[PDB]
Symmetry: C2
Subunit: 149 residues, 2 copies
């Protein structure tokens, strides 16, 4: 593409992480843009989820420690980064490393939020698998020693 | 309008490295890097703009993914490969690279979008799983092994 605006759009559309912009409206942060990676990550098309609060990705799983941290940071206008349990349209659980950055528009006096979403399910599963295997090694060490004593 | 500023903020607060390159002869030279790419590689943008990204390989050129990337760029198709890369201070990291060629038929120039992710932590975890699976299998075999 030609100008730098077209290149900025290409960069956002080809990002592997989800990228969204929300706008403060009362008690919700309303989605006003989602990129293709977010549609693929969540299983929803943009027309289905634009102009909603993204909390719907939690389903009924609302009492998560990272949720209170996000709330406090948004309240204070500070960036944050937390891993949450979210659910795709098909219902499957995935682990979402969410990065939120508040940005204040000095022209219109309005606050926007940049959100970056990364599916870290595979890394979460791998680390759980390491811990399970380490526990199995510990049991094999106990068993070699119960055979030595 | 205000959407161009938002596009810019989206790219600048991305956690992955994001770059644009342009075809120039037989190589692809950087014309834009975002802040995460500078933090990821350890280089300031001004020191590496208008260079080909292959400098991140150092002298570590015997990697199969390099030829795969080269051929994909040669054919104008996207690709994705994990390479060993080196920061300015020399430290190794595993770089998962997503490259998308985009041809501008009006100005007859080819651009490339590149996404860079440090996957060092995930590579080490998957290796750790394979090593532990082998350890568990050998320890169980030793418990089963004949005593003759
Ligand atoms: C830009 C942005 C992106 C967000 N993305 C997600 C998301 O992908 N998944 C999720 O569960 N919550 C996401 N949230 C959080 C919810 O929108 C909401 O802030 C959170 O659940 C805490 O507020 P609440 O207690 O009113 O629900 C995002 C918030 C913002 C501002
Ligand atoms: C947009 C773009 C981004 C790239 N980013 C990297 C990178 O971060 N690390 C790397 O080792 N190679 C990267 N490359 C690949 C090298 O630039 C080069 O294409 C590759 O080494 C194969 O070409 P060569 O055989 O001439 O070295 C990138 C290529 C493009 C087009």
């Amino acid at each position: 593409h030609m100008i730098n605006a077209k290149l900025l759009q290409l960069m956002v559309e080809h990002s592997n992480d989800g990228i969204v912009v929300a706008e403060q409206e009362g008690n919700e942060s309303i989605l006003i843009y989602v990129n293709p990676a977010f549609e693929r990550l969540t299983g929803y098309c943009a027309d289905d989820i634009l102009y909603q609060d993204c909390r719907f990705l939690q389903g009924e799983d609302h009492d998560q420690p990272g949720i209170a941290i996000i709330r406090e940071a948004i309240r204070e206008g500070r960036p944050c980064c937390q891993v949450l349990r979210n659910y795709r349209k098909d219902g499957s659980l995935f682990w979402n490393e969410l990065s939120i950055t508040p940005v204040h528009n000095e022209a219109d006096q309005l606050t926007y939020y940049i959100g970056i979403q990364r599916d870290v399910t595979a890394q979460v599963f791998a680390e759980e698998r390491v811990r399970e295997l380490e526990a199995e090694v510990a049991e094999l060490r106990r068993q070699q020693g119960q055979a030595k004593h």
